[PDB]
Design a binder for this molecule. Structure first.
Ligand code: CAC
Length: 102
Protein backbone atom coordinates (compact mmCIF):
# COMPACT_ATOMS: atom_id res chain seq x y z
CA UNK A 1 0.00 0.00 0.00
CA UNK A 2 2.40 2.75 1.25
CA UNK A 3 5.26 1.44 -0.83
CA UNK A 4 3.57 1.81 -4.28
CA UNK A 5 1.72 5.08 -3.54
CA UNK A 6 3.12 8.61 -3.49
CA UNK A 7 2.47 9.81 0.08
CA UNK A 8 1.54 13.11 1.71
CA UNK A 9 0.82 12.89 5.45
CA UNK A 10 -1.55 15.36 7.09
CA UNK A 11 -3.17 16.07 10.45
CA UNK A 12 -6.55 17.75 11.03
CA UNK A 13 -8.99 18.71 13.79
CA UNK A 14 -10.90 15.76 15.17
CA UNK A 15 -14.07 17.83 15.35
CA UNK A 16 -14.47 20.45 12.65
CA UNK A 17 -16.02 19.09 9.43
CA UNK A 18 -17.08 22.26 7.61
CA UNK A 19 -16.21 22.95 4.01
CA UNK A 20 -13.95 21.00 1.69
CA UNK A 21 -10.56 19.31 1.77
CA UNK A 22 -9.10 20.82 -1.39
CA UNK A 23 -5.91 19.49 -2.96
CA UNK A 24 -3.79 20.89 -5.77
CA UNK A 25 -1.92 18.46 -8.02
CA UNK A 26 0.53 19.38 -10.75
CA UNK A 27 1.42 16.95 -13.50
CA UNK A 28 1.61 16.07 -17.12
CA UNK A 29 -0.99 17.97 -19.11
CA UNK A 30 -3.98 15.83 -19.95
CA UNK A 31 -2.79 12.99 -17.73
CA UNK A 32 -5.27 10.80 -15.90
CA UNK A 33 -4.84 10.21 -12.19
CA UNK A 34 -6.37 8.76 -9.09
CA UNK A 35 -5.69 8.25 -5.43
CA UNK A 36 -7.23 8.73 -2.04
CA UNK A 37 -7.41 10.67 1.16
CA UNK A 38 -6.63 7.89 3.61
CA UNK A 39 -6.95 8.00 7.33
CA UNK A 40 -7.02 5.82 10.39
CA UNK A 41 -10.36 5.41 12.14
CA UNK A 42 -10.67 3.08 15.12
CA UNK A 43 -7.73 0.98 13.81
CA UNK A 44 -9.04 0.66 10.28
CA UNK A 45 -7.45 2.33 7.37
CA UNK A 46 -10.22 4.01 5.44
CA UNK A 47 -9.90 5.63 2.00
CA UNK A 48 -11.86 8.38 0.24
CA UNK A 49 -11.11 7.89 -3.43
CA UNK A 50 -10.46 10.77 -5.82
CA UNK A 51 -9.77 10.83 -9.55
CA UNK A 52 -9.22 13.40 -12.25
CA UNK A 53 -7.31 14.60 -15.26
CA UNK A 54 -4.78 17.36 -15.42
CA UNK A 55 -5.80 20.27 -17.60
CA UNK A 56 -3.69 21.83 -20.34
CA UNK A 57 -1.70 23.76 -17.72
CA UNK A 58 -0.92 20.51 -15.85
CA UNK A 59 -3.31 21.39 -13.05
CA UNK A 60 -5.77 19.18 -11.18
CA UNK A 61 -7.80 20.46 -8.24
CA UNK A 62 -9.53 17.79 -6.13
CA UNK A 63 -12.31 18.76 -3.77
CA UNK A 64 -13.51 16.31 -1.12
CA UNK A 65 -16.15 17.40 1.42
CA UNK A 66 -14.73 17.38 4.96
CA UNK A 67 -17.96 15.58 5.90
CA UNK A 68 -16.53 12.43 4.38
CA UNK A 69 -13.96 12.15 7.17
CA UNK A 70 -15.48 10.83 10.43
CA UNK A 71 -15.32 12.89 13.55
CA UNK A 72 -12.45 11.96 15.80
CA UNK A 73 -10.02 11.30 12.96
CA UNK A 74 -6.99 13.46 13.33
CA UNK A 75 -4.39 12.14 10.88
CA UNK A 76 -3.99 10.54 7.49
CA UNK A 77 -2.24 10.52 4.13
CA UNK A 78 -3.17 11.93 0.79
CA UNK A 79 -2.00 9.27 -1.71
CA UNK A 80 -1.45 9.27 -5.44
CA UNK A 81 -2.19 5.84 -6.91
CA UNK A 82 -2.52 5.87 -10.71
CA UNK A 83 -0.73 8.63 -12.55
CA UNK A 84 -0.47 8.20 -16.30
CA UNK A 85 2.44 10.65 -16.54
CA UNK A 86 3.95 12.72 -13.77
CA UNK A 87 1.93 13.96 -10.80
CA UNK A 88 2.76 15.61 -7.51
CA UNK A 89 0.74 17.35 -4.80
CA UNK A 90 1.70 21.00 -4.41
CA UNK A 91 -0.81 22.29 -1.85
CA UNK A 92 -3.88 21.44 0.16
CA UNK A 93 -6.33 23.42 2.21
CA UNK A 94 -8.49 21.82 4.89
CA UNK A 95 -10.28 23.76 7.58
CA UNK A 96 -7.98 26.58 8.68
CA UNK A 97 -4.80 24.98 7.38
CA UNK A 98 -3.27 26.28 4.15
CA UNK A 99 -0.44 23.85 3.35
CA UNK A 100 2.24 24.14 0.70
CA UNK A 101 4.37 21.08 -0.21
CA UNK A 102 7.85 22.50 -0.90
C1 CAC B 1 1.38 26.12 7.09
AS1 CAC B 1 2.52 24.70 6.41
C2 CAC B 1 4.15 24.57 7.49
O1 CAC B 1 1.60 23.28 6.57
O2 CAC B 1 2.72 24.91 4.63
Amino acid sequence: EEDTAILYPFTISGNDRNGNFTINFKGTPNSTNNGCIGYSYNGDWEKIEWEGSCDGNGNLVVEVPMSKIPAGVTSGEIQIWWHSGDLKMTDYKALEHHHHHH
